[PDB]
Amino acid sequence: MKRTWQPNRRKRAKTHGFRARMRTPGGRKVLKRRRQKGRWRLTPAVRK
Amino acid sequence: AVKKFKPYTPSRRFMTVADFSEITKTEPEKSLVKPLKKTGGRNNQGRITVRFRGGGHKRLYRIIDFKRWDKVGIPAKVAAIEYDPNRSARIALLHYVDGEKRYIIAPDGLQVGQQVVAGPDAPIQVGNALPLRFIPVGTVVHAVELEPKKGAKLARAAGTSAQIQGREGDYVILRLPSGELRKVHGECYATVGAVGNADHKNIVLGKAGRSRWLGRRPHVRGAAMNPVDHPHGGGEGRAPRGRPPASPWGWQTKGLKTRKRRKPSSRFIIARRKK
RNA sequence: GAGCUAGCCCUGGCCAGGGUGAAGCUGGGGUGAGACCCAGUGGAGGCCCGAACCGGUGGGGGAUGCAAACCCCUCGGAUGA
RNA sequence: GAAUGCCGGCAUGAGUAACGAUAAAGAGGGUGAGAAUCCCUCUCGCCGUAAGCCCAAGGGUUCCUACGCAAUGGUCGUCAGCGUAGGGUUAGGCGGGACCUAAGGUGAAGCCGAAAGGCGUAGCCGAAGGGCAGCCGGUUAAUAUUCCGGCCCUUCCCGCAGGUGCGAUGGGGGGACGCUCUAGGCUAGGGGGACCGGAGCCAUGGACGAGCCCGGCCAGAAGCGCAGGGUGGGAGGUAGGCAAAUCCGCCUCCCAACAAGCUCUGCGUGGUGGGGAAGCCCGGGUGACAACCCCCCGAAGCCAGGGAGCCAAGAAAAGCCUCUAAGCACAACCUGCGGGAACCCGUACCGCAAACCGACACAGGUGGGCGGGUGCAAGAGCACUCAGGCGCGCGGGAGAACCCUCGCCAAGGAACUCUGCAAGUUGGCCCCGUAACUUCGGGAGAAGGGGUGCUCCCUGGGGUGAUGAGCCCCGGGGAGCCGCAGUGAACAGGCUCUGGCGACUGUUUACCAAAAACACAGCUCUCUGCGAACUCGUAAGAGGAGGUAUAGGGAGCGACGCUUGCCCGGUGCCGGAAGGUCAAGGGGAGGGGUGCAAGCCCCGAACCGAAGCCCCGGUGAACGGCGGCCGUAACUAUAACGGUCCUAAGGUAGCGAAAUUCCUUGUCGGGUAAGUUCCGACCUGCACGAAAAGCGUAACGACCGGAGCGCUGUCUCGGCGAGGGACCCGGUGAAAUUGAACUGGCCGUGAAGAUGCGGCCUACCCGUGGCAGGACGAAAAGACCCCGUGGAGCUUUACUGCAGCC
RNA sequence: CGAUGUCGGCUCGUCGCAUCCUGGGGCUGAAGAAGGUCCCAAGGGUUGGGCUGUUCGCCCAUUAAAGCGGCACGCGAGCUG
RNA sequence: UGGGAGAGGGUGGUGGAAUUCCCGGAGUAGCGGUGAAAUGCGCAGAUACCGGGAGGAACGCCGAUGGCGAAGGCAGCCACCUGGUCCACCCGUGACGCUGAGGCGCGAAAGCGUGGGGAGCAAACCGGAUUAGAUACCCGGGUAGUCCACGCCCUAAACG
RNA sequence: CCGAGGGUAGGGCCCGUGACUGGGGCGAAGUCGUAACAAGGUAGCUGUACCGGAAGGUGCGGCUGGAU
Ligand SMILES: *C(=O)[C@H](CCSC)NC=O
Ligand SMILES: [Mg+2]
Ligand SMILES: [Mg+2]
Ligand SMILES: [Mg+2]
Ligand SMILES: [Mg+2]
Ligand SMILES: [Mg+2]
Ligand SMILES: [Mg+2]
Ligand SMILES: [Mg+2]
Ligand SMILES: [Mg+2]
Ligand SMILES: [Mg+2]
Ligand SMILES: [Mg+2]
Ligand SMILES: [Mg+2]
Ligand SMILES: [Mg+2]
Ligand SMILES: [Mg+2]
Ligand SMILES: [Mg+2]
Ligand SMILES: [Mg+2]
Ligand SMILES: [Mg+2]
Ligand SMILES: [Mg+2]
Ligand SMILES: [Mg+2]
Ligand SMILES: [Mg+2]
Ligand SMILES: [Mg+2]
Ligand SMILES: [Mg+2]
Ligand SMILES: [Mg+2]
Ligand SMILES: [Mg+2]
Ligand SMILES: [Mg+2]
Ligand SMILES: [Mg+2]
Ligand SMILES: [Mg+2]
Ligand SMILES: [Mg+2]
Ligand SMILES: [Mg+2]
Ligand SMILES: [Mg+2]
Ligand SMILES: [Mg+2]
Ligand SMILES: [Mg+2]
Ligand SMILES: [Mg+2]
Ligand SMILES: [Mg+2]
Ligand SMILES: [Mg+2]
Ligand SMILES: [Mg+2]
Ligand SMILES: [Mg+2]
Ligand SMILES: [Mg+2]
Ligand SMILES: [Mg+2]
Ligand SMILES: [Mg+2]
Ligand SMILES: [Mg+2]
Ligand SMILES: [Mg+2]
Ligand SMILES: [Mg+2]
Ligand SMILES: [Mg+2]
Ligand SMILES: [Mg+2]
Ligand SMILES: [Mg+2]
Ligand SMILES: [Mg+2]
Ligand SMILES: [Mg+2]
Ligand SMILES: [Mg+2]
Ligand SMILES: [Mg+2]
Ligand SMILES: [Mg+2]
Ligand SMILES: [Mg+2]
Ligand SMILES: [Mg+2]
Ligand SMILES: [Mg+2]
Ligand SMILES: [Mg+2]
Ligand SMILES: [Mg+2]
Ligand SMILES: [Mg+2]
Ligand SMILES: [Mg+2]
Ligand SMILES: [Mg+2]
Ligand SMILES: [Mg+2]
Ligand SMILES: [Mg+2]
Ligand SMILES: [Mg+2]
Ligand SMILES: [Mg+2]
Ligand SMILES: [Mg+2]
Ligand SMILES: [Mg+2]
Ligand SMILES: [Mg+2]
Ligand SMILES: [Mg+2]
Ligand SMILES: [Mg+2]
Ligand SMILES: [Mg+2]
Ligand SMILES: [Mg+2]
Ligand SMILES: [Mg+2]
Ligand SMILES: [Mg+2]
Ligand SMILES: [Mg+2]
Ligand SMILES: [Mg+2]
Ligand SMILES: [Mg+2]
Ligand SMILES: [Mg+2]
Ligand SMILES: [Mg+2]
Ligand SMILES: [Mg+2]
Ligand SMILES: [Mg+2]
Ligand SMILES: [Mg+2]
Ligand SMILES: [Mg+2]
Ligand SMILES: [Mg+2]
Ligand SMILES: [Mg+2]
Ligand SMILES: [Mg+2]
Ligand SMILES: [Mg+2]
Ligand SMILES: [Mg+2]
Ligand SMILES: [Mg+2]
Ligand SMILES: [Mg+2]
Ligand SMILES: [Mg+2]
Ligand SMILES: [Mg+2]
Ligand SMILES: [Mg+2]
Ligand SMILES: [Mg+2]
Ligand SMILES: [Mg+2]
Ligand SMILES: [Mg+2]
Ligand SMILES: [Mg+2]
Ligand SMILES: [Mg+2]
Ligand SMILES: [Mg+2]
Ligand SMILES: [Mg+2]
Ligand SMILES: [Mg+2]
Ligand SMILES: [Mg+2]
Ligand SMILES: [Mg+2]
Ligand SMILES: [Mg+2]
Ligand SMILES: [Mg+2]
Ligand SMILES: [Mg+2]
Ligand SMILES: [Mg+2]
Ligand SMILES: [Mg+2]
Ligand SMILES: [Mg+2]
Ligand SMILES: [Mg+2]
Ligand SMILES: [Mg+2]
Ligand SMILES: [Mg+2]
Ligand SMILES: [Mg+2]
Ligand SMILES: [Mg+2]
Ligand SMILES: [Mg+2]
Ligand SMILES: [Mg+2]
Ligand SMILES: [Mg+2]
Ligand SMILES: [Mg+2]
Ligand SMILES: [Mg+2]
Ligand SMILES: [Mg+2]
Ligand SMILES: [Mg+2]
Ligand SMILES: [Mg+2]
Ligand SMILES: [Mg+2]
Ligand SMILES: [Mg+2]
Ligand SMILES: [Mg+2]
Ligand SMILES: [Mg+2]
Ligand SMILES: [Mg+2]
Ligand SMILES: [Mg+2]
Ligand SMILES: [Mg+2]
Ligand SMILES: [Mg+2]
Ligand SMILES: [Mg+2]
Ligand SMILES: [Mg+2]
Ligand SMILES: [Mg+2]
Ligand SMILES: [Mg+2]
Ligand SMILES: [Mg+2]
Ligand SMILES: [Mg+2]
Ligand SMILES: [Mg+2]
Ligand SMILES: [Mg+2]
Ligand SMILES: [Mg+2]
Ligand SMILES: [Mg+2]
Ligand SMILES: [Mg+2]
Ligand SMILES: [Mg+2]
Ligand SMILES: [Mg+2]
Ligand SMILES: [Mg+2]
Ligand SMILES: [Mg+2]
Ligand SMILES: [Mg+2]
Ligand SMILES: [Mg+2]
Ligand SMILES: [Mg+2]
Ligand SMILES: [Mg+2]
Ligand SMILES: [Mg+2]
Ligand SMILES: [Mg+2]
Ligand SMILES: [Mg+2]
Ligand SMILES: [Mg+2]
Ligand SMILES: [Mg+2]
Ligand SMILES: [Mg+2]
Ligand SMILES: [Mg+2]
Ligand SMILES: [Mg+2]
Ligand SMILES: [Mg+2]
Ligand SMILES: [Mg+2]
Ligand SMILES: [Mg+2]
Ligand SMILES: [Mg+2]
Ligand SMILES: [Mg+2]
Ligand SMILES: [Mg+2]
Ligand SMILES: [Mg+2]
Ligand SMILES: [Mg+2]
Ligand SMILES: [Mg+2]
Ligand SMILES: [Mg+2]
Ligand SMILES: [Mg+2]
Ligand SMILES: [Mg+2]
Ligand SMILES: [Mg+2]
Ligand SMILES: [Mg+2]
Ligand SMILES: [Mg+2]
Ligand SMILES: [Mg+2]
Ligand SMILES: [Mg+2]
Ligand SMILES: [Mg+2]
Ligand SMILES: [Mg+2]
Ligand SMILES: [Mg+2]
Ligand SMILES: [Mg+2]
Ligand SMILES: [Mg+2]
Ligand SMILES: [Mg+2]
Ligand SMILES: [Mg+2]
Ligand SMILES: [Mg+2]
Ligand SMILES: [Mg+2]
Ligand SMILES: [Mg+2]
Ligand SMILES: [Mg+2]
Ligand SMILES: [Mg+2]
Ligand SMILES: [Mg+2]
Ligand SMILES: [Mg+2]
Ligand SMILES: [Mg+2]
Ligand SMILES: [Mg+2]
Ligand SMILES: [Mg+2]
Ligand SMILES: [Mg+2]
Ligand SMILES: [Mg+2]
Ligand SMILES: [Mg+2]
Ligand SMILES: [Mg+2]
Ligand SMILES: [Mg+2]
Ligand SMILES: [Mg+2]
Ligand SMILES: [Mg+2]
Ligand SMILES: [Mg+2]
Ligand SMILES: [Mg+2]
Ligand SMILES: [Mg+2]
Ligand SMILES: [Mg+2]
Ligand SMILES: [Mg+2]
Ligand SMILES: [Mg+2]
Ligand SMILES: [Mg+2]
Ligand SMILES: [Mg+2]
Ligand SMILES: [Mg+2]
Ligand SMILES: [Mg+2]
Ligand SMILES: [Mg+2]
Ligand SMILES: [Mg+2]
Ligand SMILES: [Mg+2]
Ligand SMILES: [Mg+2]
Ligand SMILES: [Mg+2]
Ligand SMILES: [Mg+2]
Ligand SMILES: [Mg+2]
Ligand SMILES: [Mg+2]
Ligand SMILES: [Mg+2]
Ligand SMILES: [Mg+2]
Ligand SMILES: [Mg+2]
Ligand SMILES: [Mg+2]
Ligand SMILES: [Mg+2]
Ligand SMILES: [Mg+2]
Ligand SMILES: [Mg+2]
Ligand SMILES: [Mg+2]
Ligand SMILES: [Mg+2]
Ligand SMILES: [Mg+2]
Ligand SMILES: [Mg+2]
Ligand SMILES: [Mg+2]
Ligand SMILES: [Mg+2]
Ligand SMILES: [Mg+2]
Ligand SMILES: [Mg+2]
Ligand SMILES: [Mg+2]
Ligand SMILES: [Mg+2]
Ligand SMILES: [Mg+2]
Ligand SMILES: [Mg+2]
Ligand SMILES: [Mg+2]
Ligand SMILES: [Mg+2]
Ligand SMILES: [Mg+2]
Ligand SMILES: [Mg+2]
Ligand SMILES: [Mg+2]
Ligand SMILES: [Mg+2]
Ligand SMILES: [Mg+2]
Ligand SMILES: [Mg+2]
Ligand SMILES: [Mg+2]
Ligand SMILES: [Mg+2]
Ligand SMILES: [Mg+2]
Ligand SMILES: [Mg+2]
Ligand SMILES: [Mg+2]
Ligand SMILES: [Mg+2]
Ligand SMILES: [Mg+2]
Ligand SMILES: [Mg+2]
Ligand SMILES: [Mg+2]
Ligand SMILES: [Mg+2]
Ligand SMILES: [Mg+2]
Ligand SMILES: [Mg+2]
Ligand SMILES: [Mg+2]
Ligand SMILES: [Mg+2]
Ligand SMILES: [Mg+2]
Ligand SMILES: [Mg+2]
Ligand SMILES: [Mg+2]
Ligand SMILES: [Mg+2]
Ligand SMILES: [Mg+2]
Ligand SMILES: [Mg+2]
Ligand SMILES: [Mg+2]
């Protein structure tokens, strides 16, 4: 049957992407926290 | 003269449709239509604020002239009468001797080819617009401004009309379509005659799909829901109201008056509505 | 977090084939004029049968499954909410 | 040493289940250390509205080639979507961008909010919508509308020529639109040919034939032809299109009109360039100077912005054309021609799947296009087949029980069972025929029946063409032939009678309920005069609605028919400028603290003083409620009638043992041999009743009762047969569970149901196929139940607050 | 209560005897035949239907008879639901 | 052909009297109602009086023992559209007539459907009386309906 | 071929019968009231409509076959 993950590149970048995060107080705290934790990726990878 | 159907389906049994007799032109004036943005009853927050809306036929908004004192003394010819999906009344296309073209609400009895005119001197004739003060007492009238230069507000639905009952200072006394007696300022414009298409109320929709074409989505009763949804919700089996009948938001809904108490226009309402 | 699901908005797309035969129109009949009757034409409809498509009625299988909802047979809708 | 402890390691179950669709395999030849599993050939089977082909998404080198097989592959492996290396994706025209705008997002102006932030016109962003110039063939191991070949085309720059009042983000036109049905003419695609081209073939009894088999085109600029779309021309006035306007709109006049002309597409033709089969020989070569022609069928595609009808009344903006404004008319723009210029990103491969989403090479899920032929009435249905693609990554045997899916069955035919659950029957098409009832549509495919193949003969009408022949479509009559059987295979209703419920088509508990539930047209009450009510928001702002009482919100009822009675004392709501009560505040009689005193400071009675409540009324399709005892008629029984108590008023019509009836299988009648169910009645209705509607109702229903006919393996009552498993052999090899175990019956005992204690009995050691009585067998720290001064959802005239409203 | 699945049915039995039948008896208000009552006896047997979920029971047609109880109201790692 | 009388019919208009309600004024202790009363209304200011407004329905006098129509039935006034009827003249047609089963149309009230309207009146219904009772007669309220438009129903002591 | 008739299925009319139910006629001395006949004590009758144990009552319009 139809499962929950139905990948869509534009959806991904526009929902979790670097620019969506920067535009919003909570999204900037996400970036701040993932930088402090030392993550190799601050934001999900999508081809674009 | 609503049209019946033969019972060749269960729904056609009761369905009636408007006769569309007065209609003389079946596509609208391209320079006078604009897109009508459907809302679904959602506001600028995206939240439903008027339940059960959406999914109706696409429509174009026809720009209507609810001022008419725009063009005092300039006569126009009634070029066509057309179907307007955005309102119950039909509309009339006016060709002004100006060359300017405009839509007005089509009063009852208005004929293609006749001439209408607006202004303090206009003859008392069906389709002409004058300030209320110059219209003789007793005249049945429609598309009435409520404050000078603010636009026709009252008596616009199919078949409605207001009747001029008397004068008092700068004001005239109108019997609105609801039966309320109200003072309306004398400089307020109005159009002689009643709104047309008076059979509109005798239309039987006939089936549930017809409501859906108009953007009416199914309305669900309070007594059909649960207590988390509605004062009438819950209960084992069917249940009577079990409390004073209430809206979903909990206010009483059989009798409870709702006009604001200290509203300034109370000084201008003579008598509240009837029947 | 509405890439699942629920509603709505914008813009596109899809619905083999067959059946029934509304109004209207035409002619004929009818009458003072009519209503109306008959025939032809016509092609309406949350109309009928049935694939795609959307479903999920009954039974059987499966039950450390092919599958954390599947399979077979049967069955509902299929121009419409 | 225990925490169903934590982390790791290793056991048991066990060589056990399983190895993932029952579309299917056999052999020969090769390679290699090794071959059911890789390569090649022949035979066989499966898909073929796909299990074939092309896009899009998503994936991201999986593509091609060489060299490999430790691991990955449910076995094997020499193979591979795997390991290593090298190679591979070529664009002005295809898609996106340097173009447009849609929802929506964002947002100079502006508005709002403790902060963060929320809005917001224009503007900007935003596409699978608008718009815009490339077709056919060849080539690579791997890309191609991209390279090459042929023939075409677009924009930008500059120049020459000719023409023009040139010029815009501004004005206007246009772009520009729905649903169903549909005409003419075409093309795609397909069928046939006794005609044209072709390697060959004559078998096994016959055929050297008007035999068999194979093929018989594709693209193309100008010009021309056919078929269509778009479109009036002139003049005068002009105050409207937020400046101007010769444009557009409006009025008038003349002319033109089912045309024509101008214009633009589609199709045909077309210089020219391509392609080209079987067979045979080794992807190639030949065939081949290949031929490339005629007839028929024919789109849902094209001409297109076509026509008609209908109501529910069907985006925007740019490109483009026209108008003028500043400006400039040495310019600038239009047309023709020439040379130059033309950027960025994608392009491999998978793509109904072993490369995407499901932890797996997972029987599930995934949008668009093409989807051939024959027959079956049609068709994308069904059977077989083309092109193309596959045999589903464990096999070999055996022919037990038992299971699954399947076939048949003597006599009987629902006796089965909660239930005809299941499975039979019926089954398409043509014709005959068809009941109660009905809202006149329907019920209806009612029911029930007859026909259905093949051959010869005669004959009717239509399409194409020519009116004819040929091809093709729909038939009508007569005479025959064969079989058990002619929709001969496959796909394809069992029917009727009568109740309950819901009018109906719809909707629902994704994943145990599809229903009588929800919705529904329709009915009623109620609020709302517009900066509406109401809803979201602290607000600004939104929705309501660019609507205006024939409208909008709320509530109940639920098509339709006939109807919807009595009670306003309580609660609600509505009305009521009196009266009563009532907060802050006003007032300050009269007190008090302090000071020498002026004074300062404090308490404070009457009185005035809102909504709310009290009080007076109204109101039921507002919340709701609609009696008890006793007596009475000339047989009896029973009470039309009376008495009395109580109430705000005492349940009317209609219905009733009911989806409601406890006693209950009430009683009677029907149906049956027999009927706790069913249907019809009766009425002492435990405990119906009138919009939480009452009683009916044609049609409708995968709803739930009851009966009958048809037919059956449901059953008496089982038997046989098929295949996939089970079983045996080779390969790979799990699981929950498990204190340890050397783990028998009885009668007792024991914490009350003992392999483990007592007494007796019985019993050589160890497995394999089976069955499930026990191990109070496994699983999940019982969902019931209680307990905890545990939790959470819900309610209200519980308490106390808060939003909101007054 | 860190779970002993709970009615009825189906299937499969097995046991007790306070015996429904069949076999053997005594008494009888036992003429015969047919009964009644009690004693011994558990070897075998103890039907098919209509109604209801039913156990039970009532009814139809038979019969030698249409027995009553236990086995976790025997039996869901055997089935039904 | 020339004339006449008439509430004959249909449409559109329109006038005054009265009732009811509303607003303003003035005024106070009852009004109403009956056989008599009570319910009811009234100091929250009624009744009675004056001015203003809204709305529906019916047309006083003329009016008669009258007129018109086939009947049902028709009454302020105006205009339009339309039927019947009588008289005079003695002009035209030349028996073209009478009746009439079926058919068709009209048809008071009440009632029905769909809209609207609603002052007065008033089935049902509620209350006050009366009465043995009083589901009546009398009194106070009051919903259909009475009115309009269209469509039905088709009855009558539709009688002379 | 036709064909008596037999079978299958579905219709039409008539008769008989049926739990129960509807009203009707009739029957020496039942119960309730008193609607009509006199102005019958509310003149009666009437078509229709609604209501009531019953006769009846009331609304609307009509008749005199009404009295004074
Ligand atoms: C009683 O029947 C009980 C009910 C469980 S589900 C409500 N069962 C076992 O306790
Ligand atoms: Mg899903
Ligand atoms: Mg998705
Ligand atoms: Mg995307
Ligand atoms: Mg996308
Ligand atoms: Mg997206
Ligand atoms: Mg976002
Ligand atoms: Mg982003
Ligand atoms: Mg911040
Ligand atoms: Mg933070
Ligand atoms: Mg990481
Ligand atoms: Mg790094
Ligand atoms: Mg992130
Ligand atoms: Mg109709
Ligand atoms: Mg009809
Ligand atoms: Mg119209
Ligand atoms: Mg526009
Ligand atoms: Mg909006
Ligand atoms: Mg917004
Ligand atoms: Mg937002
Ligand atoms: Mg709302
Ligand atoms: Mg809504
Ligand atoms: Mg509207
Ligand atoms: Mg309209
Ligand atoms: Mg005003
Ligand atoms: Mg309406
Ligand atoms: Mg609509
Ligand atoms: Mg509803
Ligand atoms: Mg509910
Ligand atoms: Mg519920
Ligand atoms: Mg919620
Ligand atoms: Mg709550
Ligand atoms: Mg609540
Ligand atoms: Mg409730
Ligand atoms: Mg409920
Ligand atoms: Mg209940
Ligand atoms: Mg409920
Ligand atoms: Mg309720
Ligand atoms: Mg209640
Ligand atoms: Mg309430
Ligand atoms: Mg009002
Ligand atoms: Mg989604
Ligand atoms: Mg379809
Ligand atoms: Mg079709
Ligand atoms: Mg048919
Ligand atoms: Mg026809
Ligand atoms: Mg037509
Ligand atoms: Mg349909
Ligand atoms: Mg059919
Ligand atoms: Mg599904
Ligand atoms: Mg299923
Ligand atoms: Mg089945
Ligand atoms: Mg299983
Ligand atoms: Mg499962
Ligand atoms: Mg399946
Ligand atoms: Mg199937
Ligand atoms: Mg169907
Ligand atoms: Mg269809
Ligand atoms: Mg639709
Ligand atoms: Mg310890
Ligand atoms: Mg453990
Ligand atoms: Mg632990
Ligand atoms: Mg441990
Ligand atoms: Mg652990
Ligand atoms: Mg370790
Ligand atoms: Mg471990
Ligand atoms: Mg291990
Ligand atoms: Mg082992
Ligand atoms: Mg084992
Ligand atoms: Mg296993
Ligand atoms: Mg397996
Ligand atoms: Mg299969
Ligand atoms: Mg072989
Ligand atoms: Mg082999
Ligand atoms: Mg091998
Ligand atoms: Mg090998
Ligand atoms: Mg091979
Ligand atoms: Mg095919
Ligand atoms: Mg991946
Ligand atoms: Mg390997
Ligand atoms: Mg290996
Ligand atoms: Mg290696
Ligand atoms: Mg492996
Ligand atoms: Mg595998
Ligand atoms: Mg090798
Ligand atoms: Mg490559
Ligand atoms: Mg090119
Ligand atoms: Mg550039
Ligand atoms: Mg833009
Ligand atoms: Mg964007
Ligand atoms: Mg853009
Ligand atoms: Mg685009
Ligand atoms: Mg392009
Ligand atoms: Mg080209
Ligand atoms: Mg190369
Ligand atoms: Mg020019
Ligand atoms: Mg247009
Ligand atoms: Mg448009
Ligand atoms: Mg569009
Ligand atoms: Mg339509
Ligand atoms: Mg072509
Ligand atoms: Mg063909
Ligand atoms: Mg031979
Ligand atoms: Mg001008
Ligand atoms: Mg085109
Ligand atoms: Mg070749
Ligand atoms: Mg050659
Ligand atoms: Mg199509
Ligand atoms: Mg087109
Ligand atoms: Mg068109
Ligand atoms: Mg726009
Ligand atoms: Mg110059
Ligand atoms: Mg650039
Ligand atoms: Mg490529
Ligand atoms: Mg591919
Ligand atoms: Mg699939
Ligand atoms: Mg596809
Ligand atoms: Mg594929
Ligand atoms: Mg793979
Ligand atoms: Mg693959
Ligand atoms: Mg596989
Ligand atoms: Mg798969
Ligand atoms: Mg072919
Ligand atoms: Mg067929
Ligand atoms: Mg295979
Ligand atoms: Mg397969
Ligand atoms: Mg396999
Ligand atoms: Mg095997
Ligand atoms: Mg074996
Ligand atoms: Mg199978
Ligand atoms: Mg067979
Ligand atoms: Mg056989
Ligand atoms: Mg048999
Ligand atoms: Mg039978
Ligand atoms: Mg039989
Ligand atoms: Mg049975
Ligand atoms: Mg069942
Ligand atoms: Mg069949
Ligand atoms: Mg019948
Ligand atoms: Mg019939
Ligand atoms: Mg019947
Ligand atoms: Mg019926
Ligand atoms: Mg009929
Ligand atoms: Mg038939
Ligand atoms: Mg025949
Ligand atoms: Mg044959
Ligand atoms: Mg069928
Ligand atoms: Mg029943
Ligand atoms: Mg239903
Ligand atoms: Mg339902
Ligand atoms: Mg019902
Ligand atoms: Mg109904
Ligand atoms: Mg309904
Ligand atoms: Mg449907
Ligand atoms: Mg479910
Ligand atoms: Mg669930
Ligand atoms: Mg679930
Ligand atoms: Mg299920
Ligand atoms: Mg359910
Ligand atoms: Mg269903
Ligand atoms: Mg529901
Ligand atoms: Mg319904
Ligand atoms: Mg209704
Ligand atoms: Mg209403
Ligand atoms: Mg709020
Ligand atoms: Mg704040
Ligand atoms: Mg708006
Ligand atoms: Mg409902
Ligand atoms: Mg009826
Ligand atoms: Mg009350
Ligand atoms: Mg009260
Ligand atoms: Mg009250
Ligand atoms: Mg107060
Ligand atoms: Mg109460
Ligand atoms: Mg209550
Ligand atoms: Mg009643
Ligand atoms: Mg009863
Ligand atoms: Mg009974
Ligand atoms: Mg009942
Ligand atoms: Mg009950
Ligand atoms: Mg009972
Ligand atoms: Mg019972
Ligand atoms: Mg009984
Ligand atoms: Mg009986
Ligand atoms: Mg009784
Ligand atoms: Mg209720
Ligand atoms: Mg109820
Ligand atoms: Mg009923
Ligand atoms: Mg029914
Ligand atoms: Mg249904
Ligand atoms: Mg159903
Ligand atoms: Mg039966
Ligand atoms: Mg069997
Ligand atoms: Mg076998
Ligand atoms: Mg092995
Ligand atoms: Mg292995
Ligand atoms: Mg041990
Ligand atoms: Mg041991
Ligand atoms: Mg042992
Ligand atoms: Mg042992
Ligand atoms: Mg014990
Ligand atoms: Mg023991
Ligand atoms: Mg032992
Ligand atoms: Mg021991
Ligand atoms: Mg011991
Ligand atoms: Mg021992
Ligand atoms: Mg011992
Ligand atoms: Mg022993
Ligand atoms: Mg073994
Ligand atoms: Mg074993
Ligand atoms: Mg066992
Ligand atoms: Mg067991
Ligand atoms: Mg087993
Ligand atoms: Mg056990
Ligand atoms: Mg235990
Ligand atoms: Mg056990
Ligand atoms: Mg725990
Ligand atoms: Mg526990
Ligand atoms: Mg638990
Ligand atoms: Mg549990
Ligand atoms: Mg307990
Ligand atoms: Mg406590
Ligand atoms: Mg405690
Ligand atoms: Mg607690
Ligand atoms: Mg709590
Ligand atoms: Mg409020
Ligand atoms: Mg327990
Ligand atoms: Mg445990
Ligand atoms: Mg348990
Ligand atoms: Mg356990
Ligand atoms: Mg059985
Ligand atoms: Mg004897
Ligand atoms: Mg024995
Ligand atoms: Mg025995
Ligand atoms: Mg029983
Ligand atoms: Mg028992
Ligand atoms: Mg019993
Ligand atoms: Mg005997
Ligand atoms: Mg027993
Ligand atoms: Mg017991
Ligand atoms: Mg018990
Ligand atoms: Mg048991
Ligand atoms: Mg048991
Ligand atoms: Mg079980
Ligand atoms: Mg059981
Ligand atoms: Mg067990
Ligand atoms: Mg057990
Ligand atoms: Mg059950
Ligand atoms: Mg008083
Ligand atoms: Mg006073
Ligand atoms: Mg009024
Ligand atoms: Mg003469
Ligand atoms: Mg009449
Ligand atoms: Mg009284
Ligand atoms: Mg008395
Ligand atoms: Mg009234
Ligand atoms: Mg008379
Ligand atoms: Mg009398
Ligand atoms: Mg009397
Ligand atoms: Mg009298
Ligand atoms: Mg009297
Ligand atoms: Mg009365």
Swiss-Prot record, chain A:
Gene Ontology molecular function terms on file: structural constituent of ribosome
Residue segments, region Disordered: 26-48
Swiss-Prot/TrEMBL keywords: Ribonucleoprotein, Ribosomal protein
GO BP annotations, alphabetical order: translation
Regions of compositional bias (Basic residues) in chain numbering: 29-48
InterPro entries per UniProt: Ribosomal_bL34 (IPR000271), Ribosomal_bL34_CS (IPR020939)
Any single GO CC term annotated in Swiss-Prot or TrEMBL for this entry: ribonucleoprotein complex
Domain of life the protein comes from: Bacteria
Coiled coil: none
Family label: Belongs to the bacterial ribosomal protein bL34 family.
Note: The open reading frame (ORF) for this protein is entirely within the ORF for the RNase P protein (RnaP). The two start codons are separated by four nucleotides.
Subunit structure: Part of the 50S ribosomal subunit.
Protein role: Found on the solvent side of the large subunit.
Protein name (record): Large ribosomal subunit protein bL34
Organism, as annotated: Thermus thermophilus (strain ATCC 27634 / DSM 579 / HB8)
Taxonomic lineage from the root: Bacteria, Thermotogati, Deinococcota, Deinococci, Thermales
Gene field: rpmH
Curated annotation (Swiss-Prot), chain B:
Gene Ontology CC: one annotated term: large ribosomal subunit
Annotated GO biological process: cytoplasmic translation
Name of one Pfam family that matches: Ribosomal_L2_C
The keyword RNA-binding is assigned to this record: yes
Compositional bias ranges of the Basic and acidic residues kind: 229-239
Keywords, alphabetical: Ribonucleoprotein, Ribosomal protein, RNA-binding, rRNA-binding
Gene3D superfamilies associated with the record: 2.30.30.30, Nucleic acid-binding proteins (2.40.50.140), Ribosomal protein L2, domain 3 (4.10.950.10)
Composition bias, Basic residues: 256-275
Region described as Disordered: spans on this chain: 222-275
Gene Ontology molecular function, alphabetical: rRNA binding; structural constituent of ribosome; transferase activity
Oligomer status and interactors: Part of the 50S ribosomal subunit. Forms a bridge to the 30S subunit in the 70S ribosome, contacting the 16S rRNA. May also make transient contacts with protein S6 during translation in the 70S ribosome.
Functional summary from the UniProt entry: One of the primary rRNA binding proteins. Required for association of the 30S and 50S subunits to form the 70S ribosome, for tRNA binding and peptide bond formation. It has been suggested to have peptidyltransferase activity; this is somewhat controversial. Makes several contacts with the 16S rRNA (forming bridge B7b) in the 70S ribosome.
HAMAP family: Ribosomal_uL2_B
Protein name: Large ribosomal subunit protein uL2
Gene: rplB
